[PDB]
C-alpha cells in the first residue's frame, strides 16, 4: 500500500559532545547505578 519509510540512527556518542563534562559525568554515574539495578531486576525476574 505504498508504505515507504526510512529512519536514520546515529551513534549515541555524538550526543555527548553536545553537553559539558559535569553533565556527562553526572549521567555516567546515574546510568551505572541504573544498570546495576537492572541486572538485579533481570536475573531475579528471569529465575522467578
Amino acid at each position: 500500500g505504498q508504505k515507504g519509510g526510512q529512519a536514520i540512527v546515529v551513534h549515541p556518542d555524538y550526543l555527548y559532545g553536545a553537553i559539558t563534562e559535569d553533565r556527562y559525568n553526572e549521567y555516567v554515574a546515574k546510568v551505572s547505578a541504573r544498570e546495576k539495578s537492572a541486572y538485579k531486576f533481570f536475573h531475579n525476574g528471569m529465575i522467578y
Binding site: 550526543l15 559532545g17 553536545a18 544498570e35
Partner: protein, 145 residues
C-alpha cells in the same frame, strides 16, 4: 606414597556459569567522547528535540534481542545465549531448595527436574534449541493445530 602425596598435587577446575548481561552501551571517558563530535556542537542542540532510543527488545524466531543478535552476528550461541534460549524455550527452569535430599540452587531440566550445569546446557539442549528456533517447518501445536 599413598593418597596424601597426590591430594596436594591434584588441582580444582572452575566450570563457567552463564552471567547474562543487559549490554548497556559502554560510556567512554569525557575526553574520548569529546573528540568524536565537533567542538562547536557543545550547547548548539536543543536536547529536548534530540530523540534517543533508551531501550529495545523483541520477541521473534530467535528469542529476544540478545539471542537474535548472537545468532545474527556470530552464527552461534555463547553460554549466556544458550542458557537464555533454554530458559525461553522452557528446557531449563530454576530451582532453589531441596532436590532428592541435597539442597540445590540452579538450573534443572523442566521435564525431569534433574540438575543441569550451565556448561552442559549446550551439549544437552543446543541441538533442540537450533531445531525449534528460527525459520523452520510450521509446527501445528504453535498455531492451534
Amino acid at each position: 606414597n599413598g593418597n596424601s602425596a597426590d591430594a596436594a598435587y591434584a588441582q580444582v577446575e572452575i566450570q563457567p556459569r552463564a552471567n547474562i548481561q543487559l549490554d548497556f552501551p559502554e560510556l567512554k571517558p569525557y575526553k574520548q567522547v569529546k573528540q568524536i563530535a565537533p567542538a562547536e556542537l557543545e550547547g548548539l542542540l536543543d536536547l529536548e528535540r534530540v530523540i534517543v532510543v533508551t531501550g529495545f527488545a523483541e520477541v521473534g524466531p530467535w528469542g529476544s534481542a540478545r539471542t537474535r543478535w548472537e545468532m545474527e552476528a556470530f552464527g552461534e550461541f555463547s553460554l549466556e545465549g544458550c542458557v537464555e534460549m533454554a530458559w525461553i524455550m522452557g528446557f531449563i527452569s530454576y530451582h532453589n531448595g531441596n532436590l532428592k535430599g541435597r539442597p540445590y540452587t540452579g538450573w534443572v531440566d523442566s521435564k525431569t527436574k534433574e540438575p543441569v550445569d550451565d556448561k552442559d546446557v549446550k551439549a544437552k539442549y543446543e541441538t533442540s534449541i537450533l531445531e525449534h528456533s528460527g525459520i523452520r517447518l510450521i509446527e501445528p501445536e504453535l498455531f492451534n493445530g
